[PDB]
Structures are given as structure tokens and as C-alpha cells.
Amino acid sequence: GSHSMRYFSTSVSRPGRGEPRFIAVGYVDDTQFVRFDSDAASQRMEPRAPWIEQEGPEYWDEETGKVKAHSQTDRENLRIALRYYNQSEAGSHTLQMMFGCDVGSDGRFLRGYHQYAYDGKDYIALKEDLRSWTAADMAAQITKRKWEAAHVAEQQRAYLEGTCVDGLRRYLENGKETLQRTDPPKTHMTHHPISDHEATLRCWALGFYPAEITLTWQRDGEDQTQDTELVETRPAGDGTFQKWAAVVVPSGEEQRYTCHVQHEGLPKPLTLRW
């Protein structure tokens, strides 16, 4: 299947408690591979996956320079946004950026992204054509006009179709033993009595990669869309993921329910029954 590279950066002001903090992380699919933390001592882009450590010293120098420059730019952007909105210096504000690219199984470019959020809400985003911007409000339209005048989209298009794809292709090769794998979910069901009239049936998926998965409960072949409890997919800490789904069943009706599991590592979806 296809693959993705993403970088996520968060800038947070903390008025009265220091200067703003910048944190950036890089991912290939669901595997983190670098980080930068403006509060940390190293002041370097740091490895976080084994297969990136083979990069030479000039990779780390170049990546460190690029991310430290972004850190400084987004710190000034917090100031500019404060001014655009006439917000008080007393408030703590957040600027998030995401960028990256998707490639197909054959390595061809599938999609590019370059987008910002301010205080947790869309601010500006490069459109799929990589030529135009979506601005979310009147402040972002000031930015949109500025970036149109400076032809920013041309430079980001060049990055996304060029450097981004080249790096992702190389990372996929260097970490192929690990990044091109699928671990199928190990599945089981547990049963937990509540009262003497009701019990919880919990359907489990463990140890799977990548994180995308679908768990659903059915009763007599009819979906239980609204009476299911579904927890967020969570990391195990070892590079795999976990998830469960639960239904409350009247005592004695356990065998009416089936759990259904879809994952790209399964050649066919599963059906579990208590």
C-alpha cells in the first residue's frame, strides 16, 4: 500500500513562565523517527527510530538548522497572530503546523500538505493543487495575501513534490525491515458481569500495525452503532497498537452478538463470537 511522511510542530506561549516552547516530531506512517524540543539541552534534531541513526553528521546538521529556523519563525508568528486578533499578552496561545506527503506503493507522489492551526482551529492550509490557500478567517486572509505576493505556494509545491518524496522514499528503503511490515491484530473476547441481569462483552485487538483498524459489534447481523463503547486506538509502546470495543448484553443473550475486525494485515475480516 501507500505511505506517508508527516512533521507536526507545536508552538505554545506561556506568559509569565518563560518564552514560548516549540516541539516538532517527524513520522513515517505511524512510526516516529525524529524530534526537536526547544526546551531540551541538545538543541539538535534527534533520532527516535533505529533506521534514521545511520544518517551522517551533515543530515543532522542540515535538519537541525531547518527545524531551528522554523522554531524561530513560528515564535514570531505567535506575536503576529496576537496583533492580527488584538489579543492580550495575558493569554496562552498555540500555533500548530503540519506538513508532509503521501506516496504510493511505487513511490509516486500522491498528495502534499502544508497547513496551520491557531488555538486548535484551522488557520491556513495549502490546497490539494499546491497552488492556492484556504484561509479560515480575516486574520488568515491577511496571511494568504502576503503568501500569494511572495509565491510561497510555489516553494512549498517544490518541496512537497521533490525533497519530501525523496526523503520518504529513502526512509522507506533504509527502514524497510520495520516500515514495510503489517502486524495483524491478535484478537480475543472478555466477559465482565455487571449486575445479575447484565454483563459487558469486550472485543480486543492487540499488537497490530499500522494503527488504522475497524472494530464493530453486531446483534443478529444488525449493527450496534449506538450502544457500543469504542476506546481510542492506543500505543502499546513497542511499535504496535491496541483497541477494544464493548457492548452491554442482557444476561443470557451473549451468543446473539458478533465482533467484526478489519485490518490491512488480515487477508479477510474476522468475526468473533463468545
Binding site: 512533521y7 516538532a24 517527524g26 534534531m45 535538519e63 531547518k66 527545524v67 529556523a69 522554523h70 519563525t73 513560528d74 514570531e76 508568528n77 503576529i80 497572530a81 492580527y84 506538513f99 502544508h114 496551520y116 488557520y123 491556513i124 488568515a140 491577511i142 496571511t143 502576503k146 503568501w147 511572495a150 510561497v152 516553494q155 512549498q156 518541496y159 525533497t163 519530501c164 525523496d166 526523503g167
Partner: peptide, 9 residues
Amino acid sequence: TYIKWPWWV
């Protein structure tokens, strides 16, 4: 590989 360019809003 990180973006080669940041820009001010």
C-alpha cells in the same frame, strides 16, 4: 527531510 523554508504569517 524538514521543509527548507518557513515564512511569517
